[PDB]
Design a protein around this ligand. Structure first.
Ligand SMILES: CC1(C)S[C@@H]2[C@H](NC(=O)[C@H](N)c3ccccc3)C(=O)N2[C@H]1C(=O)O
Length: 218
């Protein structure tokens, strides 16, 4: 698997400074790399893709670069609203992997963001991911696990059109992906839950991450 080593877990900066967050792929990943911004209680917002193309709406402050192995995300004049988590994504080959992330800081009320469920150990859970506003069958749906202080993990994806699926070997026996064309809803069923399965589970379309769902196993 391709490991993406992100240069610092924590980065201190100040409003007005220039910042550089880097990711080093352990194998060549071409220019298939994306950078995301994630604020607490929110979901990743795509900033750069194909390593250097700025996504629509993202302010010039952000710039991406690199090809093959060393990727960089630079913010020319850091602003307050920029203080967040940033992580890189590699989509050159399976399993898709992510850099453990970088928290950009200097040195708010949050309620049910996201909502979720508390289930029992050894039990099973089936998470939903309703889609709206676009042709469900035309875009892969990915599922990602996020624990609080660790790096994002990609579970697998599925093409709703024919339900073709890819699994990160690590989740092969824990997750099973399905979709329901009739209600444009993708699902993920986790089996034999342990405290290790407690996390926020996101489903994502290229450029649109869901709000996620908190699965607590107690
Ligand atoms: C080669 C691919 C992996 S890239 C594309 C889409 N990838 C995304 O939606 C997006 N980058 C994404 C968001 C969140 C987590 C992981 C990935 C996806 O899955 N498709 C595959 C395909 O077309 O063969």
């Amino acid at each position: 698997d391709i490991v993406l080593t992100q240069s610092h877990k924590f980065m201190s900066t100040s409003v007005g400074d220039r910042v550089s967050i880097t990711c080093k792929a352990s194998q060549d990943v071409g220019t298939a790399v994306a950078w995301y911004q994630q604020k607490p209680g929110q979901s990743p917002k795509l900033l750069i893709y194909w390593a250097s193309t700025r996504h629509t709406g993202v302010p010039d402050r952000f710039t991406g670069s690199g090809s093959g192995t060393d990727f960089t995300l630079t913010i020319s004049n850091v602003q307050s609203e920029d203080l967040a988590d940033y992580f890189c994504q590699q989509y050159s080959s399976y399993p898709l992997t992510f850099g453990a992330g970088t928290k950009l800081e200097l040195k708010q009320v949050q309620l049910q963001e996201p909502g979720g469920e508390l289930v029992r150990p050894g039990a099973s859970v089936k998470l939903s991911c309703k889609a709206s506003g676009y042709t469900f069958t035309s875009y892969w749906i990915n599922w990602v696990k996020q624990r609080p202080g660790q790096g994002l993990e990609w579970i697998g994806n599925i093409y709703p059109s024919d339900s073709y699926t890819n699994y990160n070997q690590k989740f092969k026996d824990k997750a099973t992906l399905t979709v329901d064309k009739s209600s444009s809803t993708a699902y993920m069923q986790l089996s034999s839950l342990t405290s290790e399965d407690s996390a926020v589970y996101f489903c994502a379309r290229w450029g649109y991450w869901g709000q996620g769902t908190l699965v607590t196993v107690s």
